[PDB]
Chain length 116, copies 3
């Protein structure tokens, strides 16, 4: 999985252990090994929702499977609660997109996942 979290909160409001705790959460929810999870954090960014600059997170989640309709309800419940607890965002200020990827469309260790 490859996760991007962008927020207009300042970098100092995203605790240093954010990536590591989000990696655990997704490892568990998506049944994926921790060494196959990358997290990007972009804090202090210009972001608006409804043209408002109130605190918000816009999140992208890519994974080779583990993203069925019912999985995504669970990932969303968990990620949203996690952003409430660690970022103090309201439940309605956490916007997530999922991308369900084929193994021919990911490259790792010098070749694609399908050709590993």
């Amino acid at each position: 999985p490859m996760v991007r979290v962008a927020t207009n909160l300042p970098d100092k409001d995203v605790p240093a252990n954010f990536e590591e705790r989000l990696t655990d959460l997704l490892a568990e929810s998506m049944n994926k090994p921790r060494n196959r999870i990358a997290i990007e954090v972009l804090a202090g960014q210009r972001i608006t929702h409804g043209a408002s600059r109130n605190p918000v997170a816009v999140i992208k989640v890519e994974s080779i499977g583990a993203l069925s309709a019912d999985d995504n309800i669970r990932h969303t419940q968990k990620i949203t609660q996690f952003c409430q607890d660690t970022l103090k965002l309201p439940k309605d200020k956490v916007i997530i997109t999922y991308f369900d990827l084929q193994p021919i469309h990911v490259g790792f260790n010098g070749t694609t996942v399908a050709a590993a």
Copy 2:
């Protein structure tokens, strides 16, 4: 919709009302409600096009529908004109990708849009 605008123009060159006006432009071109529109702006970024550092915008537009082939000509015309008027970019320096999403692949308010 969830829109990302990256530019090598400086942040001072992307006016403060940019996100507001883009939000209005998309609400109207897409017939989507203002409160379901997120805009990220990343200015002052390293970007090349044909390896040139001339001013350019690379834009991503995600939405659940409202992105048919025909819709996208309209969105492209309006977004490009808009970048011309507010960022002074040439018509041929505005690069846009559209991502037409299923509602099981979007998380908002703690669950998927499909489960709302």
Copy 3:
């Protein structure tokens, strides 16, 4: 092609000619013209892989075709070797996602690529 390279390496460690060389590498690997290749470099960024902050690149490659299973094998070998040589990244610290786009989902010069 529209390529995003994010890394936790500092900006001063990603050479000024990075985007030139990557533009040539992709024009050649994908048989795409240089003037239809955009590259965004985001360095200095928070990124973890396996929760580790060791040097890493997370790369997104969008293109209208030129992304078959076979093509992606070659793109991956090339970009990975290129990251090793210019960024001193280990072979297993280059994570790439490919997005194979329809021409109705790409806006350029004020209309879709499909309608050009």
